[PDB]
Amino acid sequence: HQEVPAKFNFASDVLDHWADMEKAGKRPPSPALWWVNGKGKELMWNFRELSENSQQAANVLSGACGLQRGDRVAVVLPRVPEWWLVILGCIRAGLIFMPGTIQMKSTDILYRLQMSKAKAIVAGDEVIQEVDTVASECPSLRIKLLVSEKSCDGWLNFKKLLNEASTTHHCVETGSQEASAIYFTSGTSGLPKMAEHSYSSLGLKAKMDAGWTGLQASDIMWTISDTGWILNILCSLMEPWALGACTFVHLLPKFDPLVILKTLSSYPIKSMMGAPIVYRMLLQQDLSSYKFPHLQNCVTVGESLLPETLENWRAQTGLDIRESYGQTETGLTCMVSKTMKIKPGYMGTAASCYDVQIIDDKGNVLPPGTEGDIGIRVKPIRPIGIFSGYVDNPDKTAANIRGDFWLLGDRGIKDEDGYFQFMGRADDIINSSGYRIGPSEVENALMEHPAVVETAVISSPDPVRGEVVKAFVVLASQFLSHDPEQLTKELQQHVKSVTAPYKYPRKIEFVLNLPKTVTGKIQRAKLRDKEWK
Numbered sequence: 001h002q003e004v005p006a007k008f009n010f011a012s013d014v015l016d017h018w019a020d021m022e023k024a025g026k027r028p029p030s031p032a033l034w035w036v037n038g039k040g041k042e043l044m045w046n047f048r049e050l051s052e053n054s055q056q057a058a059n060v061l062s063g064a065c066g067l068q069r070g071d072r073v074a075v076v077l078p079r080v081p082e083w084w085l086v087i088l089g090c091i092r093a094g095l096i097f098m099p100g101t102i103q104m105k106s107t108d109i110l111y112r113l114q115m116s117k118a119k120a121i122v123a124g125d126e127v128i129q130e131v132d133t134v135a136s137e138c139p140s141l142r143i144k145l146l147v148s149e150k151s152c153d154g155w156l157n158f159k160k161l162l163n164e165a166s167t168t169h170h171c172v173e174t175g176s177q178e179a180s181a182i183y184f185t186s187g188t189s190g191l192p193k194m195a196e197h198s199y200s201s202l203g204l205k206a207k208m209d210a211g212w213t214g215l216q217a218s219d220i221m222w223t224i225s226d227t228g229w230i231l232n233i234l235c236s237l238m239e240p241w242a243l244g245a246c247t248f249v250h251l252l253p254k255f256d257p258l259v260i261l262k263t264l265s266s267y268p269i270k271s272m273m274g275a276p277i278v279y280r281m282l283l284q285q286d287l288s289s290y291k292f293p294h295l296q297n298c299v300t301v302g303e304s305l306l307p308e309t310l311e312n313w314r315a316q317t318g319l320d321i322r323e324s325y326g327q328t329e330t331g332l333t334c335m336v337s338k339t340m341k342i343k344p345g346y347m348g349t350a351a352s353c354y355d356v357q358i359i360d361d362k363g364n365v366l367p368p369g370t371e372g373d374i375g376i377r378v379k380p381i382r383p384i385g386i387f388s389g390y391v392d393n394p395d396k397t398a399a400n401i402r403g404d405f406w407l408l409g410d411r412g413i414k415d416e417d418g419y420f421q422f423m424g425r426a427d428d429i430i431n432s433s434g435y436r437i438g439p440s441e442v443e444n445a446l447m448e449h450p451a452v453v454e455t456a457v458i459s460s461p462d463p464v465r466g467e468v469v470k471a472f473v474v475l476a477s478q479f480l481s482h483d484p485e486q487l488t489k490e491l492q493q494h495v496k497s498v499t500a501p502y503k504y505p506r507k508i509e510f511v512l513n514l515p516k517t518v519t520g521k522i523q524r525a526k527l528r529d530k531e532w533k
């Protein structure tokens with residue numbers, strides 16, 4: 001059981017507080033969301049406007065579209081203000097939001113809509129055609145909202161409908177444990193499962209963690225995230241808005257480091273968060289021309305921060321990078337908070353709620369200096385912030401609980417001051433550049449190509465990028481004498497076309513055999529260890 005209030009809602013209990021402060025004069029109109037596209041277009045909302053505009057959103061969803069409390073809404077949008085508006089709208093109307101990346105292809109979308117039985121989808125120009133290819137095969141799908149300068153035949157015009165909606169919406173009295181969002185998350189085999197989070201697991205947690213990033217009421221944070229990542233909800237949205245701070249969003253259509261750098265230099269961003277890869281790319285640029293004295297807090301998550309990266313960032317910029325850790329299922333688990341001593345190679349100590357420990361094969365807590373499995377105590381009291389379980393899959397929610405602990409699937413060592421040292425995934429999940437990729441997803445993709453009679457996909461160290469997807473392939477006999485550079489390029493594009501590109505094998509190595517079990521199952525462990533020295 002849990003020690004929460006009966007009811008909770010981030011929109012009413014947190015965001016509307018900051019709005020009411022402005023309305024009542026107790027605070028000046030303070031910036032809440034500052035958006036830019038990099039082509040001279042910018043837009044900005046104070047908290048009051050954000051409230052009003054997001055009520056319009058909830059009216060559009062529950063009014064004009066008649067979506068009902070508990071209905072599941074897929075959201076597939078680029079970095080545009082409407083995403084933040086749609087998410088707030090869902091929270092207000094009691095609608096379950098299910099973000100996914102705009103990189104998604106049509107099969108990805110079919111899987112997700114069918115498994116979730118989504119009643120609606122909010123999408124942008126990038127994925128309209130892909131949705132439309134498979135939409136008819138999704139019986140539950142009743143509402144298609146498009147966010148776009150163009151109108152389209154079969155899709156409701158979201159922007160038009162928002163302008164017509166009323167700026168008053170009565171927030172649903174949502175329960176603490178009531179489903180708020182479903183994030184699809186990759187597994188060690190098979191296809192993505194549905195991680196369910198409550199109104200309190202996200203919102204209340206985020207309110208209790210408010211400030212962990214060093215951010216403060218009158219500052220600006222720039223989280224750099226794919227809108228389909230849980231990072232975007234916890235860091236880009238809830239963290240700053242729990243504090244009354246401003247959140248910065250750049251469209252960043254092309255993930256260009258020079259663009260990131262100009263933006264840091266040109267705008268008064270005080271805190272920035274982003275996956276390690278971002279900092280590594282920025283260090284390859286000319287930091288001395290593009291300076292940013294205003295920047296105080298740099299945080300990082302979704303990958304192991306290398307001591308080399310940390311050290312250089314210090315050298316070049318005079319700032320520390322503070323590492324943080326977690327997963328879709330647990331949210332912010334560990335971190336180096338602002339006032340903590342930094343220890344290179346360590347990701348910090350337990351987040352406030354959580355009692356985190358290295359546990360053994362039986363489920364018992366281990367001493368410092370001993371490698372084991374990183375876990376969070378969840379019995380008898382599940383702490384605020386833990387998710388509600390995998391949807392329709394109590395079995396697989398259970399398979400991750402050992403004794404009184406939720407297992408994260410990560411190995412680690414804890415030091416004398418309680419700092420965790422990440423020691424690798426215990427299973428086959430791969431972590432590239434902030435994305436979390438299941439191998440069966442990439443393997444299936446390859447297997448649709450006729451040159452691939454057999455394949456096995458693992459993680460692999462790149463000395464520039466970090467952890468990158470590698471594919472071992474077994475070529476059909478009738479492909480052996482091909483140019484391996486071109487074949488590889490071909491195979492890569494094949495993946496880029498059939499599922500989201502972020503999971504495309506950045507390395508491919510051809511072989512005649514693949515090690516297996518004496519039962520037939522492929523030995524990815526054996527291939528990973530050889531790869532990682």
Ligand SMILES: CC(C)Cc1ccc([C@H](C)C(=O)O)cc1
Binds near residue numbers: 185229301302325434
């Ligand atoms: C605080 C938050 C960013 C924790 C966190 C860290 C990593 C992940 C990965 C990318 C996943 O998708 O499982 C999710 C959430």
